[PDB]
Structure 1
């Protein structure tokens, strides 16, 4: 099998296979229901199946017309179950839930339901029972394009429904209550906070489902230019929703990571920074004639902290310092022999202070890594430029 990262899966640990939206991983084994081992070209690990999208020709398109019609009848039953079992009971229970609590945890979820019935209704009209592969559906998306914007208001306040859901879950009253409703509407053994997560999950699923329908769709197909037309529109609304969601998450995994680093000296990282750019293992000389230390480098926007692995507990990292990139420039050294300094070089570059005569030498192993790095530095500057600007 082969899937595609829908979203980044940032991880404070090295174990978890980390990746960016688009990275394609190869699935080896899927013993678990919601946990499978992924293999990448150089990286390897286990990823969350919930954060990824699975992948003659007419038969392939027809299959496409069917899964889509099915994932939506599925997604709607979820909405029905959510409002019928969860929202309808909370309102009745004026004694456990205020109007404020209800708006916070649910929101316009009901509003999205109304939208979905009619969007489902129009699609079922377009489906071709005789020859499923002729289903002209591209348009159905194109006429309901202005409705999908209600989702953005649901993504903004989603994390506020989780905080109020985690606060109520602590009480045994709300536990049994939430466990009681889940059993009445006949839902799987997934909680409430996970169901409230399906809408924020489908709006994204839409773009991939469409791309897949465009590969097995031919150009003369009366639907072709429409299938291509619906893909684009959605995409914008999905980016506008993310960029918010990708950026917001990357702040918890940082402070989370900083409390893991031993003997941390200095101000917290989020005081000046708020985004990590690139990390790896490189050899570095603090000053000319100095001793070579093997350290693991972390390149943030505005700064770069360096640490020292525990020799036996490889996952253990000691804090050994940090470099301010605002004052430093990245001199790209050429192989051969260095001037005192006075060492020999292979895949090395340099960091020169802007006002001082301060200099630091770095040594990667592969050329792939000196490139990735020198590209990582070009990235942290455009970001501070893009940020400050």
Structure 2
């Protein structure tokens, strides 16, 4: 015991937070959603869609989950409850949080936007006053499922700690811990980083004179970007461009001479066909120039060669690190698929 009891504490706490959480879901879908649907004159279809997301779906799933959990609860002996199986058979269901975790910041945006009108303020205040919730604004209550999907592996780790190796629930609790950890990280990497993938499309559209395929055809991450001087070929003329490095390719633009916030597409490089040669200080061979803070890009199959100058040394280092970064990313992406 006091270990064989601790587990009973963990089980009971989990059950608690689940009942409270499903109650918060109820107070959300009944207290806020319903009333906003009732008032077309204040909330569009688009507005509702942005603010609440798939929360009704979430509630619908949580109901069944908590239901099976209560089925698995042992009243004669709480710490005997076998609850791993529950998480395991509903392991797919949790992916509906992905969506919710994606459109959350947008919900915070529209909420902050609608918190400027006293109408919506008094309305929300009233709604929260009817459903008997705590004095937390709606933006707070809208964070609870992001919290809850993050809390799960924390609660599973604790349950495992006070689970005996011979417990019929041991392997299931373990497996489920692995599962929820996986889920949380998948949510995270997919939403955050692949919506980083989203915004580069915006940037691309901001660019003028676009030549070639869309960048998102081969790439999917902005590594580094900076202004550097460069020379396309030996005896070439020095040009001031702005470089954008992505996985597989590096696009370069020219800044308008007057409207500085304007970019004209000037070409791209296939990094899968180029190696980075770090050039030391001093004097170059034909080519044939003098150098400080400089490096070079060499074609693997061709004798093609390009010259690059940063301004500072910090930038030479940042850039070299950015190329190493790019190669590591290519290797890792092709390895993971």
TM-score, structure 1 normalization: 0.54
Flag the 1:138–1:293 CA change in 2: closer, same or farther, 3 A. farther
Correspondence for 2:14 among 50, 68, 88:
68
Instruction: Report the Cα offset of residue 322 of structure 1.
Output: 18
Unaligned stretches of 5+ in structure 1? 1-55
Which has the higher mean CA deviation after the structures are superposed, 138-147 or 353-362? 353-362
- Compare the two structures and name the one with the higher helix fraction: 2
Larger radius of gyration: 2
SS in structure 1 at match of 2:314: helix
**Mapped partners of 1:128, 1:313: distance in 2:** 71
Asked if the contact 2:194/2:220 (under 8 Å) is kept, the reply is no
SS in structure 2 at match of 1:384: helix
Asked if the contact 2:241/2:255 (under 8 Å) is kept, the reply is yes
Flag the 1:129–1:285 CA change in 2: closer, same or farther, 3 A. farther
Instruction: Report the Cα offset of residue 342 of structure 1.
Output: 22
Which has the higher mean CA deviation after the structures are superposed, 163-172 or 260-269? 260-269
Flag the 1:367–1:156 CA change in 2: closer, same or farther, 3 A. closer
Q: Answer 1 or 2: higher relative contact order, Cα 8 Å, separation at least 6.
A: 2
- Aligned residue-pair number: 334
Flag the 1:347–1:155 CA change in 2: closer, same or farther, 3 A. same
Asked if the contact 2:279/2:294 (under 8 Å) is kept, the reply is yes
Instruction: Report the Cα offset of residue 339 of structure 1.
Output: 18
TM-score, structure 2 normalization: 0.61
Asked if the contact 2:208/2:264 (under 8 Å) is kept, the reply is yes
SS in structure 2 at match of 1:205: helix
- 1:227-270 alpha-carbon deviations (Å, 9 max, x no partner): 12322333443333211233268799999999999999999999
**Mapped partners of 2:311, 2:79: distance in 1:** 52
Instruction: Report the Cα offset of residue 66 of structure 1.
Output: 1.9
Name the counterpart of 2:42: 96
Instruction: Report the Cα offset of residue 96 of structure 1.
Output: 0.8
**Mapped partners of 2:11, 2:318: distance in 1:** 41
Instruction: Report the Cα offset of residue 90 of structure 1.
Output: 0.7
- 1:199-253 alpha-carbon deviations (Å, 9 max, x no partner): 1221232223212222321221111111123223334433332112332687999
Instruction: Report the Cα offset of residue 317 of structure 1.
Output: 25
